[PDB]
Amino acid sequence: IRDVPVLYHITGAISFVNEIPWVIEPVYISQWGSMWIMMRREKRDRRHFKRMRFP
Amino acid sequence: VYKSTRSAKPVGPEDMGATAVYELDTEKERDAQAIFERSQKIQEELRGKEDDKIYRGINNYQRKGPIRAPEHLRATVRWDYQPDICKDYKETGFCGFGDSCKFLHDRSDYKHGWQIERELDECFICRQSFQNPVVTKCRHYFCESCALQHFRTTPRCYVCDQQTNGVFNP
Amino acid sequence: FGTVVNALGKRVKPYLPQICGTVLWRLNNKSAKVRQQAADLISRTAVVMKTCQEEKLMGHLGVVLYEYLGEEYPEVLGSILGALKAIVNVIGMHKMTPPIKDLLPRLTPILKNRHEKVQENCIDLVGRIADRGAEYVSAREWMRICFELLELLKAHKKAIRRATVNTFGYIAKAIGPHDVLATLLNNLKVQERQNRVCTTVAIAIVAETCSPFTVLPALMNEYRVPELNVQNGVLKSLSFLFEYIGEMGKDYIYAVTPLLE
Amino acid sequence: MDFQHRPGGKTGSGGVASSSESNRDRRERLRQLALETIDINKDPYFMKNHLG
Amino acid sequence: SNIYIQEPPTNGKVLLKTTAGDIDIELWSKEAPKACRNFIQLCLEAYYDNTIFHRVVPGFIVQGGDPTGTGSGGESIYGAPFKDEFHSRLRFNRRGLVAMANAGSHDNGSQFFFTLGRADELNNKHTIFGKVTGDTVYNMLRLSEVDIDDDERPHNPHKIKSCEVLFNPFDDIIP
Amino acid sequence: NMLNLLIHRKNLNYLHLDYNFNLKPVKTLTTKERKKSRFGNAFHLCREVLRLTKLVVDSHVQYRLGNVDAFQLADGLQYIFAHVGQLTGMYRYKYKLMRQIRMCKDLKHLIYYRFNTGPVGKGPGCGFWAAGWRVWLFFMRGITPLLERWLGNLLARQFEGRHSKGV
Amino acid sequence: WEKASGFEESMKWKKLTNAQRSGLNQIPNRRFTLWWSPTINRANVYVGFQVQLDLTGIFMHGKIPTLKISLIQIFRAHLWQKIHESIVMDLCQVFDQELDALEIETVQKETIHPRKSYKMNSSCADILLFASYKWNVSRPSLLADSKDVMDSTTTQKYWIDIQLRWGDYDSHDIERYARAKFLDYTTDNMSIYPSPTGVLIAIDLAYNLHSAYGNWFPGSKPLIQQAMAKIMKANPALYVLRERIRKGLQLYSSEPTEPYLSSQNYGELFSNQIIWFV
RNA sequence: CGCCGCCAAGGUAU
Ligand SMILES: O=P(O)(O)O[C@H]1[C@H](OP(=O)(O)O)[C@H](OP(=O)(O)O)[C@H](OP(=O)(O)O)[C@@H](OP(=O)(O)O)[C@H]1OP(=O)(O)O
Ligand SMILES: [Mg+2]
Ligand SMILES: [Zn+2]
């Protein structure tokens, strides 16, 4: 879900999300590599794929 | 009556449309890109063979063309209501540009789409009962004694003063 | 072919789809001037198909000849207009699939063609519409074509010039003799003949088709304009007026006697 | 198409007439020309009649 | 594809047999808990036996759920009528929908109605809690005959003979 | 609620701005209402970037409806971040992002031809989306003050009127 | 090709004020754009924003004004709905033979609803067939097959609706277009169909050919195959659109006699389907 | 050793 802080207006004008991402790089590269391997193994084990119906 | 199947599964798919296939054109294994891929592949395999005359099909004697549609996509449709009509040729009969005007030269003043849209959304003389209702020469249904007293008043009719000429009938 | 189909009549019934298919294929033919024969053949076969109980194919070819009149050849366009003329003659006008609501506005750019056969067939169909279909307009078209019917004059056949005055008369019968009248009086300063006498006859026809005393006060008034041609035009219009009315001039002799003196 | 460097025209014009209205306006313009030249030259004997 | 069904997914399905045929009503139990709860409870009590359809407005509505047949008899299993439960994705843009019949404020019981078309005047006024699986919607389109004799109540109204429960979440008891 | 209320304030009532952020006339516009209602780059480019984030948030809420898994959303918003121009029309009123589209369209091959090494499969499933994500963050990172200033000038031109012969 | 008054010695001595004298002629620039129409308007290079005009279904994949003007002269005056009404009049008149099937009581033409002919998101039925009892329909299938297993629900009525489209060189396979469209409208919830059974007929105007996808009772398929081949052979609206293309495109034949086309089986052999002789 | 991928004002007057 990624719960997140926000900074919004009283009347509901605009809701600024106020958070800088702040990720450390070796755990970042390892997470992307882990999901790379899992997603290669997921596409290898799928019979055929249909993407989104993008609207 | 339409009997049911007696199942707990709902009416359709589980994704509720998240895998629309868009199979309006020729499908995947029969499309011309797939035919070109098969032809290219079999031209890559048979190389040491020199006219083996099993002939393999039509195009194999020795991705362009009909390109495959994106299956994962609807085209974003818009209603182009705005026509290009020579108004000075439509309602008047003479365009000042002649044949150099870019528009249509149309003169059919029929309804547009939006007009269809906002049209689809929505006796008598004495004033008594007919004591023997009887006629004259000219359809005038009168009474008996009332028209006798009327002839005693004036020898003509009452509605349009027609010459009765002593002619009074039922 | 017309005499053969007129002698046949009902007996040509298992032949009309083949002949009309031959015509509908024939109507392109390289555009090497073999297209007026097919349209003239339609104009001949217009009579025999009504007497053979065939109106569905009439409705088929009416919307074909409705837009095969976008030609550049005048010799083909005249035969197309003659075929459409024969369609309007043999069929009742209010029950045709090219209705008058969108047919006469397609006839109006054809009116600006200076070929004599195109002009003849066009203004004959316009006269047929003007005396039998004057309710299919917005009342503005008969006023904007009568100015173009002034430029329709000076055509040297005498059939165009005798049909166009009848078209003026039925235009004025349709939309009243008070607006085309000023057009016919403004056609009296031309310097050219065959354009001032051919509107003199039009003044006579607007005088004689609809009732009198609608054209006579302005015709008396135009003599006050100090020009030679308008005075000669109003005098010759009085000549054709009394020539066309005859016995109805018993009340107007005392009114135009101070003009004739 | 070059919409800026084409021979243009205004909408709802109607065009220009045939020979009849053109030489009618030509004769009226020559009439006005003759009247203004006799107005400058001050000729009291030039007179127009009841028929032009 | 571009059809865009435009509705949340369903949960729970019941079968309902009338003389007009079989109707498989599938409910939105998540988007409307109390109305679907009352509906499955009254189906499990066999409460809709001998219940007739007492109002037919052809093209607009066909009403049921009245054991008396007058248009005012409605008894929930709550003791009191319950609240309105609305949803922005559940509107009256089509036919085949089921909604609790209401008379103004929060007054909903056994009295409900099937839809027969576009019902934009009923938006934000009634609680949509279910639809009908297609290939069976014509068994309730046979309910709309012009035999009404009045604004409602035709000659021979169709009655519900049985009400089966195909799927039953949030387990309940008949009292 | 702001891109429709601009139209509602400017007294148009014929441009049907929809939720998926497009724009459609309805009434076959005459000259006095065509020239009043056409927008420049500040309205339209904001409309396309809001349509882009609208498709992104629609993808995320489609995931959290509960009928599609994580790999399918990965390939989905990878296609979204890699194939703008095909489905958003954002290049139409700002051409400089077109090269960035090419900058996406190139790097996808760096992704897509490294799934296919070995017995993996030719079909879709390319769900490595961070690379197009970084460059379309780099777009808005430099374009935010630009069309911020453009929409500020738009609000000035709308609310306090124009200056005809001032500057 | 174009021969009618090309040189044009003396046109008719008009005035030729400014633009009709010196400006360029727009009609060759629009008939040439009309001539390469499916490969200037192809659907699958940019598959995004498409802009269909009023009353038509071209969808215009591109912002090309010249092609839009050249395609509206051949969809000029309500002839889309005229093709609609004409072919539904043909395939309701051809069902006057009622006893050759099991039994057909009436063939109801429903309420004539405008905007139906080009509404692509929603649809309704066009005509309806009633019965007394139990029409045994089949599984939904095409018209290019011959199996006809016929094991489905016995139903009462049977709706028939027609569809229209336009070419575009990348999607001309209406055996799949009709199937996908019938699946979309039988999974749609906006439908006001009288049955989920009846056939959806799709005909392809540019590259003109015909198909359908639905279920079939025994007196339906081989009747209406030849009956709609007769519609493709003889139809006023679907031929005046052809001669309107001819008047907007200047195509002409150069033969003295008719090019061997008749009611013979030779003539549909070359309709880009594969037919063998044995 | 493998360019290139396009919107609008310009016209149906005010
Ligand atoms: O046609 P290619 O030059 O061979 O490249 C295609 C193409 O990518 P590009 O056109 O951007 O280079 C496809 O994307 P589309 O533009 O056709 O939408 C892409 O598919 P994805 O959209 O999933 O990325 C994938 O084609 P495929 O569908 O087979 O995966 C890909 O490379 P390949 O055709 O060699 O696989
Ligand atoms: Mg200008
Ligand atoms: Zn023009």
PDB file of N, CA and C in Angstrom, chain C residues 25 28-32 59-60 63-64 67-68 70-73 112-115, chain G residues 1-6 12-14 236 240 243-244 247 251-255 258:
ATOM      1  N   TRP C  25     -24.265  -0.307 -65.904  1.00  0.00           N
ATOM      2  CA  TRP C  25     -22.856  -0.559 -66.183  1.00  0.00           C
ATOM      3  C   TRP C  25     -22.341   0.324 -67.313  1.00  0.00           C
ATOM      4  N   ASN C  28     -20.604   4.468 -67.224  1.00  0.00           N
ATOM      5  CA  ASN C  28     -19.255   4.968 -66.964  1.00  0.00           C
ATOM      6  C   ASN C  28     -18.431   4.992 -68.246  1.00  0.00           C
ATOM      7  N   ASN C  29     -18.152   3.822 -68.839  1.00  0.00           N
ATOM      8  CA  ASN C  29     -17.626   3.564 -70.196  1.00  0.00           C
ATOM      9  C   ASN C  29     -16.570   4.571 -70.676  1.00  0.00           C
ATOM     10  N   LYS C  30     -15.466   4.656 -69.917  1.00  0.00           N
ATOM     11  CA  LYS C  30     -14.232   5.389 -70.236  1.00  0.00           C
ATOM     12  C   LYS C  30     -14.410   6.916 -70.217  1.00  0.00           C
ATOM     13  N   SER C  31     -15.646   7.408 -70.058  1.00  0.00           N
ATOM     14  CA  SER C  31     -16.066   8.780 -70.356  1.00  0.00           C
ATOM     15  C   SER C  31     -15.606   9.244 -71.739  1.00  0.00           C
ATOM     16  N   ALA C  32     -15.600   8.339 -72.715  1.00  0.00           N
ATOM     17  CA  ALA C  32     -15.314   8.656 -74.113  1.00  0.00           C
ATOM     18  C   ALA C  32     -16.606   8.902 -74.881  1.00  0.00           C
ATOM     19  N   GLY C  59     -37.219   4.087 -58.087  1.00  0.00           N
ATOM     20  CA  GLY C  59     -36.570   4.596 -56.892  1.00  0.00           C
ATOM     21  C   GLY C  59     -35.112   4.208 -56.789  1.00  0.00           C
ATOM     22  N   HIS C  60     -34.720   3.104 -57.429  1.00  0.00           N
ATOM     23  CA  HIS C  60     -33.314   2.735 -57.511  1.00  0.00           C
ATOM     24  C   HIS C  60     -32.521   3.702 -58.378  1.00  0.00           C
ATOM     25  N   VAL C  63     -32.125   7.933 -57.321  1.00  0.00           N
ATOM     26  CA  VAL C  63     -30.964   8.308 -56.514  1.00  0.00           C
ATOM     27  C   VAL C  63     -29.642   7.995 -57.197  1.00  0.00           C
ATOM     28  N   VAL C  64     -29.668   7.391 -58.381  1.00  0.00           N
ATOM     29  CA  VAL C  64     -28.481   7.281 -59.222  1.00  0.00           C
ATOM     30  C   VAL C  64     -28.323   8.519 -60.100  1.00  0.00           C
ATOM     31  N   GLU C  67     -27.134  12.032 -58.431  1.00  0.00           N
ATOM     32  CA  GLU C  67     -25.744  12.464 -58.368  1.00  0.00           C
ATOM     33  C   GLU C  67     -24.839  11.889 -59.453  1.00  0.00           C
ATOM     34  N   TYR C  68     -25.386  11.415 -60.577  1.00  0.00           N
ATOM     35  CA  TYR C  68     -24.595  11.402 -61.807  1.00  0.00           C
ATOM     36  C   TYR C  68     -24.691  12.700 -62.600  1.00  0.00           C
ATOM     37  N   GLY C  70     -22.987  15.415 -61.639  1.00  0.00           N
ATOM     38  CA  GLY C  70     -21.805  16.179 -61.291  1.00  0.00           C
ATOM     39  C   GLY C  70     -20.759  16.131 -62.386  1.00  0.00           C
ATOM     40  N   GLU C  71     -21.221  16.155 -63.633  1.00  0.00           N
ATOM     41  CA  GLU C  71     -20.377  15.931 -64.793  1.00  0.00           C
ATOM     42  C   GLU C  71     -19.637  17.204 -65.191  1.00  0.00           C
ATOM     43  N   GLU C  72     -18.581  17.024 -65.983  1.00  0.00           N
ATOM     44  CA  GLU C  72     -17.903  18.129 -66.642  1.00  0.00           C
ATOM     45  C   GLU C  72     -18.266  18.245 -68.116  1.00  0.00           C
ATOM     46  N   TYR C  73     -18.752  17.166 -68.727  1.00  0.00           N
ATOM     47  CA  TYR C  73     -19.259  17.183 -70.093  1.00  0.00           C
ATOM     48  C   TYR C  73     -20.670  17.754 -70.117  1.00  0.00           C
ATOM     49  N   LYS C 112     -25.764  27.691 -63.702  1.00  0.00           N
ATOM     50  CA  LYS C 112     -24.672  28.579 -64.077  1.00  0.00           C
ATOM     51  C   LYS C 112     -23.776  28.001 -65.173  1.00  0.00           C
ATOM     52  N   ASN C 113     -24.246  26.989 -65.899  1.00  0.00           N
ATOM     53  CA  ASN C 113     -23.535  26.432 -67.043  1.00  0.00           C
ATOM     54  C   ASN C 113     -24.127  27.053 -68.302  1.00  0.00           C
ATOM     55  N   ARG C 114     -23.273  27.610 -69.159  1.00  0.00           N
ATOM     56  CA  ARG C 114     -23.761  28.360 -70.310  1.00  0.00           C
ATOM     57  C   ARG C 114     -23.947  27.505 -71.562  1.00  0.00           C
ATOM     58  N   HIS C 115     -24.061  26.184 -71.429  1.00  0.00           N
ATOM     59  CA  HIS C 115     -24.378  25.336 -72.574  1.00  0.00           C
ATOM     60  C   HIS C 115     -25.890  25.280 -72.764  1.00  0.00           C
TER      61      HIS C 115
ATOM     62  N   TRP G   1      -8.992   6.451 -66.040  1.00  0.00           N
ATOM     63  CA  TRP G   1      -8.855   7.599 -65.159  1.00  0.00           C
ATOM     64  C   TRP G   1      -9.455   8.851 -65.798  1.00  0.00           C
ATOM     65  N   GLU G   2      -9.161  10.005 -65.186  1.00  0.00           N
ATOM     66  CA  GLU G   2      -9.809  11.277 -65.498  1.00  0.00           C
ATOM     67  C   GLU G   2      -9.627  11.681 -66.958  1.00  0.00           C
ATOM     68  N   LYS G   3     -10.759  11.915 -67.622  1.00  0.00           N
ATOM     69  CA  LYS G   3     -10.801  12.317 -69.019  1.00  0.00           C
ATOM     70  C   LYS G   3     -11.749  13.489 -69.253  1.00  0.00           C
ATOM     71  N   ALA G   4     -12.748  13.682 -68.391  1.00  0.00           N
ATOM     72  CA  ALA G   4     -13.835  14.639 -68.599  1.00  0.00           C
ATOM     73  C   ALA G   4     -13.320  16.063 -68.410  1.00  0.00           C
ATOM     74  N   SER G   5     -13.127  16.758 -69.541  1.00  0.00           N
ATOM     75  CA  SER G   5     -12.773  18.184 -69.605  1.00  0.00           C
ATOM     76  C   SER G   5     -11.456  18.484 -68.891  1.00  0.00           C
ATOM     77  N   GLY G   6     -10.422  17.698 -69.203  1.00  0.00           N
ATOM     78  CA  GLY G   6      -9.114  17.953 -68.628  1.00  0.00           C
ATOM     79  C   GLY G   6      -8.424  19.160 -69.229  1.00  0.00           C
ATOM     80  N   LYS G  12     -16.591  27.974 -69.903  1.00  0.00           N
ATOM     81  CA  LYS G  12     -17.752  28.763 -70.313  1.00  0.00           C
ATOM     82  C   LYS G  12     -17.312  30.145 -69.851  1.00  0.00           C
ATOM     83  N   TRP G  13     -17.400  31.183 -70.692  1.00  0.00           N
ATOM     84  CA  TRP G  13     -16.596  32.381 -70.438  1.00  0.00           C
ATOM     85  C   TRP G  13     -17.097  33.205 -69.246  1.00  0.00           C
ATOM     86  N   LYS G  14     -16.813  32.695 -68.050  1.00  0.00           N
ATOM     87  CA  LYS G  14     -17.153  33.348 -66.794  1.00  0.00           C
ATOM     88  C   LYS G  14     -16.043  34.331 -66.413  1.00  0.00           C
ATOM     89  N   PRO G 236     -30.089  -0.588 -53.424  1.00  0.00           N
ATOM     90  CA  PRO G 236     -29.936   0.808 -53.878  1.00  0.00           C
ATOM     91  C   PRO G 236     -28.892   1.609 -53.112  1.00  0.00           C
ATOM     92  N   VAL G 240     -25.374   3.129 -54.484  1.00  0.00           N
ATOM     93  CA  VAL G 240     -25.205   4.557 -54.727  1.00  0.00           C
ATOM     94  C   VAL G 240     -24.055   5.109 -53.904  1.00  0.00           C
ATOM     95  N   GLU G 243     -21.314   4.412 -56.512  1.00  0.00           N
ATOM     96  CA  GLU G 243     -21.235   5.386 -57.600  1.00  0.00           C
ATOM     97  C   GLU G 243     -20.974   6.798 -57.076  1.00  0.00           C
ATOM     98  N   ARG G 244     -21.215   7.050 -55.785  1.00  0.00           N
ATOM     99  CA  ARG G 244     -20.747   8.289 -55.176  1.00  0.00           C
ATOM    100  C   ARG G 244     -19.234   8.285 -54.984  1.00  0.00           C
ATOM    101  N   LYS G 247     -18.089   9.109 -58.489  1.00  0.00           N
ATOM    102  CA  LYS G 247     -18.175  10.537 -58.763  1.00  0.00           C
ATOM    103  C   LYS G 247     -17.193  11.365 -57.945  1.00  0.00           C
ATOM    104  N   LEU G 251     -13.449   6.993 -61.543  1.00  0.00           N
ATOM    105  CA  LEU G 251     -13.123   5.674 -62.067  1.00  0.00           C
ATOM    106  C   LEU G 251     -14.085   5.329 -63.197  1.00  0.00           C
ATOM    107  N   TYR G 252     -13.548   4.767 -64.279  1.00  0.00           N
ATOM    108  CA  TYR G 252     -14.354   4.438 -65.447  1.00  0.00           C
ATOM    109  C   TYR G 252     -13.846   3.145 -66.070  1.00  0.00           C
ATOM    110  N   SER G 253     -14.767   2.373 -66.647  1.00  0.00           N
ATOM    111  CA  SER G 253     -14.426   1.119 -67.304  1.00  0.00           C
ATOM    112  C   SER G 253     -14.151   1.356 -68.788  1.00  0.00           C
ATOM    113  N   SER G 254     -13.339   0.479 -69.390  1.00  0.00           N
ATOM    114  CA  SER G 254     -13.027   0.622 -70.809  1.00  0.00           C
ATOM    115  C   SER G 254     -13.357  -0.641 -71.596  1.00  0.00           C
ATOM    116  N   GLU G 255     -14.547  -1.201 -71.394  1.00  0.00           N
ATOM    117  CA  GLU G 255     -14.969  -2.406 -72.085  1.00  0.00           C
ATOM    118  C   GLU G 255     -16.282  -2.167 -72.828  1.00  0.00           C
ATOM    119  N   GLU G 258     -20.393  -6.406 -70.884  1.00  0.00           N
ATOM    120  CA  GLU G 258     -20.379  -6.583 -69.435  1.00  0.00           C
ATOM    121  C   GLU G 258     -19.339  -7.630 -69.036  1.00  0.00           C
TER     122      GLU G 258
END
